[PDB]
Design a protein around this ligand. Sequence first.
Ligand SMILES: [Ca+2]
Ligand SMILES: [Ca+2]
Ligand SMILES: [Ca+2]
Ligand SMILES: [Ca+2]
Length: 319
Amino acid sequence: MATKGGTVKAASGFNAMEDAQTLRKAMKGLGTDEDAIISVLAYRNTAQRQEIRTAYKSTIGRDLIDDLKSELSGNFEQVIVGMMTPTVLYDVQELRRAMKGAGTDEGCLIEILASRTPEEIRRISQTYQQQYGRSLEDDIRSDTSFMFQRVLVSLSAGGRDEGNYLDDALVRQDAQDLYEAGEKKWGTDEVKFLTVLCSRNRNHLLHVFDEYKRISQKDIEQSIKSETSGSFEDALLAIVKCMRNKSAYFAEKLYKSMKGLGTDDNTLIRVMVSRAEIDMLDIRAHFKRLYGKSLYSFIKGDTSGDYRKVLLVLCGGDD
Ligand SMILES: [Ca+2]
Ligand SMILES: [Ca+2]
Ligand SMILES: [Ca+2]
Ligand SMILES: [Ca+2]
């Protein structure tokens, strides 16, 4: 009830070798058995899917992920491969993809860097270096600029204060500083905003937000919107939403990824996959609260085929 949890749980009586043979069997003939692949992979958690990769490489003597890529395509392949990717590496590969090539997927960078915990970020930074031979900070600096770059670099350090300690004097001054640096200033001391928003512990910031409303008669979101713009504004706003309620933040991302013509499949897939074993239950609750419709109704109405089948398993039910 409290921290609801994920929608993908460990399968009972798990046998990695058996599941591996099922997948091998499913990809052996003229025409792939997609439902068989789903029946196994969507119903095993990330840890179990890894044991299946190992077992597959043993008995079969082949790479499970590469073979799946050879028989699958489109969005169905993208979601399956994501589900097959180890937790930290998945985020790493998403950040890399967000920056590699012309332009940058700002939404993805902001999303991962603003919603991941200090500990999840340190792991991400370490695996990014391992995977690509350059630091995450290095690539951020190469793909982004100015204050947006500045904030992303700070988030990538994973240095936010931990704990829930409330230093009242600090809360009052932070609110005052943010007020002096924005509303009462011609222009904006953007580094003060990013510094306060990136380094203070969650509880502290929630109280800073209240104190700021108290002295300025404006929500910090209203001032951020009126004081900043572009990607810097987007980053700052994401940080605030993730501080107020992370599950609600993702609910809104899901909504926005499907609302309107077509689908932002990259966002839809990344969110469903990355939060399936963490707070999908809470995301579902917040999603229906915010929009009056279940996340299930949206996924079913925006997708089809095998891709839709897998996404609905990650959703884990209607509301
Ligand atoms: Ca780029
Ligand atoms: Ca100002
Ligand atoms: Ca603005
Ligand atoms: Ca749509």
